[PDB]
Design a protein around this nucleic acid. Sequence first.
DNA 1: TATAGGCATACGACCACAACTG
DNA 2: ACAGTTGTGGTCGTATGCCT
Length: 756
Amino acid sequence: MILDTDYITEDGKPVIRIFKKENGEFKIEYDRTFEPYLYALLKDDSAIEEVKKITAERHGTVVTVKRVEKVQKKFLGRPVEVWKLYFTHPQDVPAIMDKIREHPAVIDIYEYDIPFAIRYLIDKGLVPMEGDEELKLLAFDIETLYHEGEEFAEGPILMISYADEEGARVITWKNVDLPYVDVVSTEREMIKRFLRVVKEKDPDVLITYDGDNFDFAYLKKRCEKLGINFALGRDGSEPKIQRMGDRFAVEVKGRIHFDLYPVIRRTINLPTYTLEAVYEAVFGQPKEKVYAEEITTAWETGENLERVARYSMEDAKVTYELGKEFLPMEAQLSRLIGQSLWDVSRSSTGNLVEWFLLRKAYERNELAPNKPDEKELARRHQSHEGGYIKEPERGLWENIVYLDFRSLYPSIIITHNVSPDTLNREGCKEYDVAPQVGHRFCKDFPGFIPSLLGDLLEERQKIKKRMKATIDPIERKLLDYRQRAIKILANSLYGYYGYARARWYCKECAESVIAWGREYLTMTIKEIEEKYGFKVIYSDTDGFFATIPGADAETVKKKAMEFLKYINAKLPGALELEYEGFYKRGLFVTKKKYAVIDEEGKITTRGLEIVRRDWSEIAKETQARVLEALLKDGDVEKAVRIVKEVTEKLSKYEVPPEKLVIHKQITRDLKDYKATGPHVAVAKRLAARGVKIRPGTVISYIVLKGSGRIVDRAIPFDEFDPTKHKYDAEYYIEKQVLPAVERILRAFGYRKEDLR
DNA sequence: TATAGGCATACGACCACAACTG
DNA sequence: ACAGTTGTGGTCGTATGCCT
Ligand SMILES: Nc1ncnc2c1ncn2[C@H]1C[C@H](O)[C@@H](COP(=O)(O)NP(=O)(O)OP(=O)(O)O)O1
Ligand SMILES: [Mg+2]
Ligand SMILES: [Mg+2]
Ligand SMILES: [Mg+2]
Ligand SMILES: [Mg+2]
Ligand SMILES: [Mg+2]
């Protein structure tokens, strides 16, 4: 099993290291023969003689073109002759590529910015995380001494907890009488002991929770002051901290630093991403938080360290169990993308697609297009028309079927061969022409991206079959992971076509996919209304809700099935319409906001404040209770009674503050806010003290009683003291609960109620 | 240091104008 | 028979998180 690749330099030459785990033992394979390269397209073949003369300087060492080779490749489905220029060292390329491209004989260069180890995996056809080797996992966390004015890692590390299959322990240097706590003399001895623990256990995966941005940097500052060689890597190296955009990321050579925080942020949608909230969302058990001020007051008085030791231990144990439940999915994703788990777990959608496409391109000898320069990037920032949304027939409908397409945009791409290399290609027998926009796509040869998508969808349907076939939960979970990986990749390709930073960008493919989707959806709607007597209540991008207005459930169902058999005979290629489900009642409030209930009583809710993080739980829960009373029981008096009880408990200050927290994400540097709202005000105040606010931080605040601007009365929920502070009852009544419930009531048809 | 676009929703920022102040 | 602050109704663009 390949765990990772990197490279070192020996006497000026790059040496690839492949970190593998085979039949239970760790191994390092060295490759000294791999050369970096780029491609150049030239106007005159005779001009190469004076492109071998191009030289640069790295920082005092002179950089030359090691050798050249004339090659034939496909670019956008057409044959091209280019020159492959090799260099001695991958750092040569950034220094000389600019003088090459800006040569008069050079039209353009290609593939000059794929990082060396990624390039190695691609060109050798190696794929990490393959095979059936079992990796050893170990989670760890640290607890530090925090004060507000202090510089980073000013204070010592208090405890280091770690957890694995054997159990969870805490190393610390004040005495604590619990069976799982190991006391040592000093902070220095605690760090040395922890390092000994990792070296003894020798895990393949080190799991943290935001270790990328706190734990490893804290450990590094402390080891620099204490004089520790923090030799965590299997080759004896220290963790390697590097800048990734606006944040940092940490490698531990020979192991995999699995930082759960990015993984979970992009895998599940939660109102807040504290470790406590994540753990209770994933496993349903609560976990108590101890705040830094508490930990410090405790440490300085020696008072209640048993409580803080338990907090530290629990941090480690839940980090271990979360890692153990999220790792397999991320390993399947990494096996599909074809890159190391460290890379895939930290990467955005665009780069995952890019890495997959570069590998497939390499297999097919297709030259990769370049990332846009600044001018082209600015040019691609015009938007295009999106999917079709019918304005709903608002209100309460009975006996509803939902019909939708199976993978609409990928099906369109596959059926109509929508690709930059088939767009307006000349000289073909057969074309498909997108509606309303007129883009023509050759049908005589499969395009690059359509063929890849074909393979992906075929194998996802094979998997969905043999998933429920197997009796084995072993293989059922492995197949579910593989199938969900395929889905994420496949449904990112429509978006990638329109991603301004994409290599295989094509605005006309994005526009054509939209046009064909709008056509298929609206034409199917017309067919069910004209030929089958259905009324279409609501429609969004790829499906629609419909009923036969006077008909009972069984005739609605059977007519829908007849329509499905009729429409699918007519749909071309991979296009197919499916029966998603039947709903006894549905409440369509507005575009993107509605709720339906099935015959068994289960309510599903889309778009309503019920699902959003930036609405307080008192409002979300009252809206759900009003929704259940109206859509499940049809009891308006019960709903009015519910609202009256909640507004009364609010105005008597009886509702616990945790049900009043509002969560909103900071989406940018605080400097770049032109309108400063409550969560921005809170975050700016926090930044003016110690707290570092980066994009994606979730601010959780509560609105205090008082007059004047709400931005000045909102405090972080962490600082709320039910003795000191009183919350703003009237804000939570008038601006949170009543709007959310009155929108439901008005959608049912009950406009005026006392609600007081 | 965004895979896409479409939507509902609330509010801050700005503004013009009136009333009121040393 | 005054500049400067304050209050008072408006737009209108900013911001977020959802949906497919
Ligand atoms: N995150 C996203 N980005 C871009 N387009 C998206 C999207 N989500 C949906 N669409 C657009 C593009 C899609 O073509 C369409 C529906 O995609 P699904 O709702 O994921 N349902 P499907 O049938 O594909 O998977 P399953 O087998 O689970 O039902 O909406
Ligand atoms: Mg921690
Ligand atoms: Mg902690
Ligand atoms: Mg579906
Ligand atoms: Mg988006
Ligand atoms: Mg769908």
